[PDB]
């Protein structure tokens, strides 16, 4: 194990944290009190610099940490850093998804795993692929312990969910979109419009992906941090 | 011996016999 | 002498009252009476001549040139095309894939026609005869038939000589060899039949 290396160098010192420095992150204002944390980036040399290194960075943070609450424990978001003015590197919204434990305990036998996804874009040239998931419900006084649904019912539910999802996505920007994901308001009218077809249960929004991005947009990026 | 390997040996013998007959005729 | 058909396009001279007739390699899918738009502002249609800096990523082009003003250099044989893999704005250069598989950066001012050259899949029918090969090579050059160096006399060829038809020395020839010694394989990095995919 330890004594196994025969030779190391094919051709044939100081602690890096002295040069390493600390930089605080600032999440967009669409969330609550930020208190993101702190990252380590190498010294701002004349060739690489700290700012350009911070440009290509993403920080994974749970939504419960941002909100200062509990019911958002099983939701987490990546924050994409875009610019830094010094010790307060600002970031934006990248994507939201649940935990592996949440997904695995969500998926259970004797149920259904209706799913939907549509490739859409927002007003500000922001293309996002919105994912939606749905499970059939066992109604009260039911003795049939499988809650199976017909393929036509699945098709209709998926079509309705996609229609409402596109209606929500169209005519909105990232700030309002995130401010409406946060309180979990999509599932309300999703289940309202899909409850007639099937009772439905465990309605959540799976994940979003950031595919295409417009220009830097400093003027409105500064709005998310003051 | 296994029937599969016996059959394979039979195919090999059949190929050899066919080659011998072809070279004779 | 060329498998690819030649398309004749007439263009009005914008500085004098006359008709200037170009010589174009007939792309696959073109037909008589179809208008051909050549220029940067022209749309993306088969046969149109556009600069390489205007076509989107993944475009298939033909009759491209190494430098602007070369009147079309690369991808001029029947059934070949060039695939635009990327664009680089600063010091504008379009990264492309050639039919041979090599990737070369060329200036965005280079112009290539849209589509593939007609007559693709020319070499699938075997010549099947000496007559067809002779007629094909007669229209090209005096490069047929060719006599083997083993049957060649020893003075006529380094490989020749001896009672039996054998090379004698190594067939591979170094790049540093002088004229007269370059008889056989030249700079053989890997000799013999390759096993598996070429992975080009």
């Amino acid at each position: 194990a330890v004594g196994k290396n025969k030779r190391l160098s094919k051709g044939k010192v100081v602690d890096p944290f002295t040069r390493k420095e600390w930089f605080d992150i600032k999440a967009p204002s669409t969330f609550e009190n930020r208190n993101v944390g702190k990252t380590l980036v190498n010294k701002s040399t004349g060739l690489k610099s700290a700012s350009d290194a911070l440009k290509g960075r993403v920080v994974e943070v749970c939504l419960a940490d941002l909100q200062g609450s509990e019911d958002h424990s099983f939701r987490k978001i990546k924050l994409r850093v875009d610019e830094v003015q010094g010790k307060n590197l600002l970031t934006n919204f990248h994507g939201m998804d649940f935990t592996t434990d949440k997904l695995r305990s969500m998926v259970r036998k004797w149920q259904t795993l209706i799913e939907a996804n549509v490739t859409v874009k927002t007003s500000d040239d922001y293309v996002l692929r919105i994912f939606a998931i749905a499970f059939t419900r066992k109604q009260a006084n039911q003795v049939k312990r499988h809650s199976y649904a017909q393929s036509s019912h699945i098709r209709a539910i998926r079509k309705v969910i996609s229609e409402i999802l596109t209606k929500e996505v169209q005519g909105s920007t990232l700030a309002q979109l995130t401010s409406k994901l946060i309180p979990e308001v999509i599932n309300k009218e999703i289940e309202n419009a899909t409850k007639d077809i099937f009772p439905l249960q465990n309605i959540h929004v799976r994940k979003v992906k950031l595919l295409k991005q417009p220009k830097f947009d400093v003027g409105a990026l500064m709005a998310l941090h003051g | 011996m296994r029937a599969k390997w016996r059959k394979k040996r039979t195919r090999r013998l059949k190929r050899k016999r066919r080659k011998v007959r072809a070279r004779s005729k | 002498g060329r498998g690819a058909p030649l398309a004749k396009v007439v263009f009005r001279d914008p500085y004098k009252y006359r008709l200037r007739e170009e010589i174009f390699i007939a792309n696959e899918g073109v037909h008589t009476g179809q208008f051909i738009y050549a220029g940067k502002k022209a749309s993306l249609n088969v046969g149109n001549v556009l600069p390489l800096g205007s076509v989107p990523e993944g475009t298939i082009v033909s009759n491209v040139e190494e430098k602007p003003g070369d009147r079309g250099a690369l991808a001029r044989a029947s059934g070949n095309y060039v695939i635009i893999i990327g664009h680089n704005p600063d010091e504008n250069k379009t990264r492309v894939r050639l039919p041979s598989g090599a990737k070369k950066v060329i200036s965005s001012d280079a112009r290539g026609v849209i589509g593939v050259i007609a007559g693709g899949g020319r070499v699938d029918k075997p010549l099947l005869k000496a007559g067809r090969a002779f007629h094909k090579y007669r229209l090209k050059r005096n490069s047929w038939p060719k006599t083997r160096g083993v049957a060649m006399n020893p003075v006529d060829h380094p490989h020749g000589g001896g009672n039996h038809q054998h090379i004698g020395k190594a067939s591979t020839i170094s790049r540093g060899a002088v004229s007269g010694q370059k008889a056989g394989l030249i700079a053989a990095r890997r000799t013999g039949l390759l096993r598996g995919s070429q992975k080009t």
């Binding site: - | - | 690819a4 058909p5 007939a26 899918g29 037909h31 993944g58 589509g115 593939v116 693709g120």
Partner: protein, 91 residues
């Protein structure tokens, strides 16, 4: 009256040039000498004039295509792909 069993058009070659080459040239010659139709009229009068040139006696339109076929699978794929990029660019 089915004068031949399988050789077909290559019956002119007789006992020559092997069998696999004869079959390949038979298939390629069938594809070459088959008549097609002009996309501008819809009448099966398209014939082959030269290497890659498909002429007609009625539509009077010459089309540049494959050596032995009016349209090639690779050519059609390239045309569809180019149309796809054009639509993506303008939309």
């Amino acid at each position: 009256a089915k004068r031949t069993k399988k050789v077909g058009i290559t019956g002119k070659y007789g006992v020559r040039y092997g069998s696999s080459l004869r079959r390949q040239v038979k298939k390629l010659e069938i594809q070459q000498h088959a008549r097609y139709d002009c996309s501008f009229c819809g009448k099966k009068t398209v014939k082959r004039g030269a290497a890659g040139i498909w002429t007609c006696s009625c539509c009077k339109k010459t089309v540049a295509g494959g050596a032995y076929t009016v349209s090639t699978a690779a050519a059609a794929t390239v045309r569809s792909t180019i149309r796809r990029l054009r639509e993506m660019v303008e939309a």
